[PDB]
Ligand binder design. Structure first.
Ligand SMILES: [Br-]
Lengths: 212, 217, 297
């Protein structure tokens, strides 16, 4: 098979910067390389076909070069709408093979999270469960720590954190933290604290409530 | 206008087989190649194989021979993908694609995708819980617990409220999926104006609406 | 060994609008004239083209055929030198150096390609004549701003079926394999010619490789033309389909898909001939390598 090694795995580019993705094939494929752009919830979109051929409608900031084994895909100047996964696809011989993909993220200014905590709803407590939810919204960069405290004591077990993808409007990230307990144990404690520590502010952002 | 319409999501038991469909319009599949592509999380894209509906000849990627069978019906302009001996590593979105032309072998048009879930877990409807503030701006929440399988569709005010909305990827905690969503509006908007969480789970044919009310308590 | 068919030589005019092939119908425009006979049969207004095709178009093909036959003596002259230059046995029976016979080959090669152009110059002027007649004849369609496009899109449906009958990807696979083998053999011959002292056989290989390069170039030219026709006509099939157009646009419509399809058929003919030519040259090269390595004793 023609192995297709796409490089690098991930990129963080600021607005207006040039994007360079390389793609190395294990066999000579002339210029039968194609570049697809994949966004969450949508099928792949072909941007450049064999012979560095820009597809109709694709903006001119997209281009490609290479003949033989070494190929390059370039975004002349980065836009926010270009945040996506990119794949090369060799069309020279069967079987068709894709590159592993490049995850391209936008490099924006740092932004602190907006934190809010939510006690269990009345409906869930009636069903015998108790989830405490904390939302950490619109922060950058993506790395963030969340710490749960029950009556001041740190709690590690029973926590689930889900990260959202980079927002297309403001390029920030958001994270959901959920601490699930039994209703019996939830009623045995008074205060529930959600502590968010991000690179932006050295001291944590603390939101809490008391079960009253 | 070229359009490719695939069949709906599938939940299959491990070791069983599934057959996906893809109906074409705007072109005759007899004149092109139909392709199937596997899109798995963290696995990028993977070519499965192709068929020439004019004579029925097929070609497969080596990892899919003896596990995938592609067929086509020209009278209905439909291409089919059968996957047998399914394992959990075959849980993916499966795309149907058309080649550019006889002299353009790359993928030109795609279908919307078909989710195949390979698992023995039973279908379970979600519980939907409204999350009001703790009792400037106000953030509201919605919690969707204990459902299977993916996907669930969550909208705010049936979708007319999308600004300031953050729906988070579902996580699988012991058999069942949990999903949450947050919406942020100006304090003069809520609770003056009504805000409702709408959750749909087609696999269980359930539709739930939960209006977020201020806590009493 | 021997090459007994040199149909692969062709030439274009100075303006590079016309390409002359030794295969009938020698010009791609004849295929367009044949395609316009189909378009005209679906319009009652312009079915007087039945008389134009049987007089002017039929005569052009015969005149092109007679023009090609005029160069038969020059063709045999080139074919003669080719059989001496690729056969070390026949070459040693004469006393002229390899450089001298190679010059004679280039002179006789270009005198022959020059003949197929020179004797076909008047047939070229007639092609432009017949095109303008077809343009003027299309004016008699009983429309102006609402000319129906059903015939135009009906032919596109036919052409997609015709495209699928050509195994394009096999042609592309074969040209890339033999191009790779040809380029590999060229670099190989320049290394081993330092090791093995056999000037005659080495030069016979180099001459055949020179001919292979020419044939590969012609194959690549026609494969690209065929690919362009298929891609463009298929794009029209996937595109927006207006039901009515102006009359001058419908003229361009017929001229557009007609020229595309004429190039597709003209290219299909040449690629089928060049495929055979290239495979026969490859066997000669490897035959000559056998003689180079088979008598080391
Ligand atoms: Br028009």
């Amino acid at each position: 098979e023609t192995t297709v090694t796409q490089s690098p795995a991930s990129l963080s580019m600021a607005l207006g910067e040039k994007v360079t993705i390389r793609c190395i094939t294990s066999t000579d494929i002339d210029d039968d390389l194609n570049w697809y752009q994949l966004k969450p919830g949508e099928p792949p979109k072909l941007l450049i076909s064999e012979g560095n051929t820009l597809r109709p409608g694709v903006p001119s900031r997209f281009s490609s070069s290479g003949y033989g084994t070494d190929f390059v895909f370039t975004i002349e100047n980065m836009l926010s709408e270009d945040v996506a996964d990119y794949y090369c696809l060799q069309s020279d011989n069967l079987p068709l093979t894709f590159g592993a993909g490049t995850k391209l993220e936008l490099k924006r200014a740092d932004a602190a999270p907006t934190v809010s905590i939510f006690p269990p709803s009345s409906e869930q407590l009636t069903s015998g469960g108790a989830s405490v939810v904390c939302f950490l919204n619109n922060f950058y960069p993506k790395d963030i720590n969340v710490k749960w405290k029950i009556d001041g004591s740190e709690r590690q077990n029973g926590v689930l954190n889900s990260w959202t993808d980079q927002d297309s409007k403001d390029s920030t990230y958001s994270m959901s933290s959920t601490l699930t307990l039994t209703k019996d144990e939830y009623e045995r404690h008074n205060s529930y604290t959600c502590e968010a520590t991000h690179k932006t502010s050295t001291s944590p952002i603390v939101k809490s409530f008391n079960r009253n | 206008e070229v359009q490719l319409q695939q069949s709906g999501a599938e939940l299959v038991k491990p070791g069983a087989s599934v057959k996906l469909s893809c109906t074409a319009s705007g072109f005759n599949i007899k004149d092109h190649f139909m392709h199937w592509v596997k899109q798995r999380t963290a696995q990028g894209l993977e070519w499965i194989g192709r068929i020439d509906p004019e004579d029925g000849e097929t070609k497969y990627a080596p990892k899919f021979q003896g596990t995938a069978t592609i067929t086509a019906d020209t009278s209905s302009n439909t291409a089919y993908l059968q996957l047998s001996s399914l394992t959990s590593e075959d849980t993916a979105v499966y795309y149907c694609a058309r080649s550019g032309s006889v002299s353009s072998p790359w993928f030109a048009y795609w279908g919307q995708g078909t989710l195949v879930t390979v698992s023995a877990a039973k279908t379970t409807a979600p519980s939907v819980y409204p999350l009001a503030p703790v009792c400037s701006s106000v953030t509201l929440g919605c919690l969707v617990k204990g459902y299977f399988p993916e996907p669930v569709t969550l909208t705010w005010n049936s979708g007319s409220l999308s600004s300031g909305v953050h729906t988070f990827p579902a996580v699988l905690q012991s058999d069942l999926y949990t999903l949450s969503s947050s919406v942020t509006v100006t304090s003069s908007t809520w609770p003056s104006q009504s805000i409702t969480c709408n959750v749909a789970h087609p696999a269980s044919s359930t539709k739930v609406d939960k209006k977020i009310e201020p806590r009493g308590p | 060994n021997t090459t007994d068919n040199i149909d692969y030589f062709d030439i274009s005019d100075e303006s590079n609008y016309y390409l002359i092939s030794q295969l009938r119908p020698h010009f791609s425009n004849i295929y367009f004239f044949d395609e316009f006979k189909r378009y005209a049969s679906y319009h009652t207004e312009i079915k007087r083209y039945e008389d134009i095709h049987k007089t002017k178009v039929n005569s052009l093909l015969n005149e092109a055929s007679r023009a090609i036959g005029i160069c038969n003596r020059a063709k045999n002259t080139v074919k003669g030198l080719i059989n001496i230059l690729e056969n070390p046995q026949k070459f040693k029976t004469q006393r002229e150096s390899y450089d001298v016979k190679l010059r004679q080959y280039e002179e006789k090669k270009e005198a022959f390609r020059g003949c197929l152009l020179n004797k076909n110059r008047k047939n070229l002027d007639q092609i432009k004549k017949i095109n303008n007649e077809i343009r003027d004849l299309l004016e008699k369609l009983k429309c102006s701003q609402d000319c129906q496009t059903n015939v135009y899109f009906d032919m596109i449906k036919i052409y997609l079926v015709d495209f699928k009958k050509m195994p394009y990807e096999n042609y592309d696979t074969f040209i890339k394999q033999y191009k790779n083998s040809y380029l590999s053999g060229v670099d190989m011959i320049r290394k081993i010619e330092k090791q093995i002292d056999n000037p005659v056989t080495i030069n016979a290989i180099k001459f055949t490789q020179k001919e292979m390069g020419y044939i590969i170039d012609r194959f690549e030219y026609h494969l690209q033309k065929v690919k362009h026709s298929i891609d463009q006509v298929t794009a029209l099939s996937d595109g927006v389909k207006p039901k009515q157009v102006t009359k001058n646009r419908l003229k361009e419509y017929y001229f557009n898909i007609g020229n595309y399809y004429s190039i597709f058929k003209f290219g299909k003919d040449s690629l089928n001939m060049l495929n055979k030519a290239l495979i026969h040259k490859e066997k000669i090269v490897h035959n000559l390598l056998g003689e180079l390595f088979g008598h080391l004793e």
